[PDB]
């Protein structure tokens, strides 16, 4: 509905004889779409990247933290592709990005970027290089505890 | 281009015609290494790592057995030239690791 209203205003402006830039202002929106976000990261236009944690297949985003680290972009892994879809008016979104915001929110964006850096990336600097999984089952852990207790007693 | 002799036999044989220099056909650009392709392949290499046979070749090259590494690479890949190129690439990888360390 907002796009139809903007197009009606621009059509009125063209009919009366001014350019559409005279009636429309420069937009500031969340950037989304996986190919678009990867292109923005490669062109170093993205200021902040949020990557969904449950993308299936995982190959679509498995290179993204390494790409952001090489390009110097701050990234954060966030729970919910549906949660990003609620931002981008979709059912799901694999990744979202901010390139630029308005002047009343640039301070908030800088504070968020610094907070994401200090409270996420410094904490996951060491744990991102570790192997996951390897957890044993309940009965297997109980059997292992029982045999270690038996070996310690004997 | 070398001008032909005008004879039916011998070196540079054939009918004498003035030759033209041709611009490179864009179909002949295949194999040229592009900048984005460099960046993407480097990122994928450092994300994915090495194959087990690549690890074996790297261990042989660090131990200094070069002919054995070439023979192992030929047995794995299939051809001598592919083995030579793979051994050169793993030598380059060893060189970057050594210059970092």
């Amino acid at each position: 509905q907002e796009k139809k209203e903007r197009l009606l205003r621009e059509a009125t402006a063209i009919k009366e004889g001014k350019k559409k830039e005279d009636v429309s202002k420069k937009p500031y929106t969340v950037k989304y779409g996986l190919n678009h976000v990867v292109g923005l990261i490669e062109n170093k236009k993205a200021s902040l990247v949020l990557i969904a944690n449950d993308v299936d297949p995982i190959e679509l985003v498995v290179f993204l933290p390494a790409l952001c680290r090489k390009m110097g972009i701050p990234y954060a892994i966030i729970k919910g592709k549906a949660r990003l879809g609620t931002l981008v008016h979709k059912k799901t979104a694999a990744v979202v990005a901010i390139t630029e915001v308005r002047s009343e929110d640039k301070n908030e964006l800088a504070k968020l970027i610094s907070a994401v850096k200090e409270g996420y990336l410094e904490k996951v600097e060491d744990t991102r290089k570790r192997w996951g999984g390897g957890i044993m089952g309940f009965k297997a852990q109980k059997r292992e505890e029982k045999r270690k207790k038996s070996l310690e007693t004997a | 281009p070398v001008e032909r002799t005008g004879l039916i036999r011998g070196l540079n044989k054939g009918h004498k015609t003035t030759r033209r220099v041709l611009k490179e056909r864009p179909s002949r650009r295949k194999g040229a290494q592009s900048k984005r392709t460099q960046f993407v392949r480097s990122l994928i290499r450092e994300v994915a790592g090495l194959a087990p046979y690549e690890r074996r070749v790297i261990e042989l090259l660090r131990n200094g057995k070069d002919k054995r590494a070439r023979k192992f690479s030929k047995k794995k890949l299939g051809t001598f030239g592919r083995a030579k190129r793979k051994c050169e690439e793993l030598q380059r990888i060893i060189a970057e690791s050594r210059r970092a360390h």
Partner: peptide
């Protein structure tokens, strides 16, 4: 930066 192509403007 990495670019697929030269972009307009």
């Amino acid at each position: 930066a990495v670019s697929v192509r030269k972009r307009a403007g």
